[PDB]
Amino acid sequence: EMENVQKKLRKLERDYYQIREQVVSAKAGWCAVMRMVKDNGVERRLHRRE
Amino acid sequence: AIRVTQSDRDLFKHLITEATSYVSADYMRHANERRTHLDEALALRGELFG
Amino acid sequence: TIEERVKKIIGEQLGVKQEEVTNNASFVEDLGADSLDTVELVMALEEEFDTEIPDEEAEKITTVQAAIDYIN
Amino acid sequence: SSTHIEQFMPVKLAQALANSLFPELDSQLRAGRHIGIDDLDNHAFLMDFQEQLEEFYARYNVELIRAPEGFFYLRPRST
């Protein structure tokens, strides 16, 4: 059973790697907007948590 | 005097409300996609470690 | 090199200047990276050098000097 | 139908140009005079037909402009 579960573990590992790469790529792009919205446009007017 | 100021306020208000509606929506869309993929990655990370 | 690949990752994951990121520059107070920003920073550090880090030992890292110390 | 003001001009614009205050105001505006709140007759007339006068003077390649403080004036274009 532990061997059988380790195969599930490895599937999860590959999935996790893919998701990791995608998340990092998103952050890299979003950084530019953050540097650009330092004009005090983000604090409440743009970031409407509602 | 009223007839002047009333008009000016109408124009200010309409522009501000529509512009914020137009921009904030997509800004939050992006933030939410990034949040979602990060959350999925963290759940996968924790489950893999355990 | 590792000691400058760390800067490559930190600057482009927090958006701060290369000059700002010194060895002792802490992420939260100097670089301003908050909870999720630091999470993404550690994920990027993992990806760059294709390694993995424990949860507690990773969260212990809260500075450029500490970042390199665990990296190198 | 034919021989009808609407064929050639909007009714409100013709109504404005037919007013007794128009010649004085046109002569002054072309001369560069600014119009404030104090001269009620002229200012109220400008407010009543603002869009018609702006569209009319546009034929000359000049903008009839309204500052936020409420005073009108003419700004010519390059052409």
Swiss-Prot record, chain C:
One of its GO terms (cellular component) is membrane. GO terms for molecular function: acyl binding; acyl carrier activity; lipid binding; phosphopantetheine binding. One of its GO terms (biological process) is response to xenobiotic stimulus. SUPFAM superfamilies: ACP-like. Changing S35 to A/T: Loss of phosphopantetheinylation, and inhibition of cell growth. It is found in: Cytoplasm. Residues 1-72 form the Carrier domain. Keywords: Cytoplasm, Fatty acid biosynthesis, Fatty acid metabolism, Lipid biosynthesis, Lipid metabolism, Phosphopantetheine, Phosphoprotein. The modification O-(pantetheine 4'-phosphoryl)serine is found at S35. 4'-phosphopantetheine is transferred from CoA to a specific serine of apo-ACP by AcpS. This modification is essential for activity because fatty acids are bound in thioester linkage to the sulfhydryl of the prosthetic group. PROSITE patterns: CARRIER, PHOSPHOPANTETHEINE. Pathway: Lipid metabolism; fatty acid biosynthesis. Interacts with MukB. Carrier of the growing fatty acid chain in fatty acid biosynthesis. Belongs to the acyl carrier protein (ACP) family. This is Acyl carrier protein. The gene is acpP.
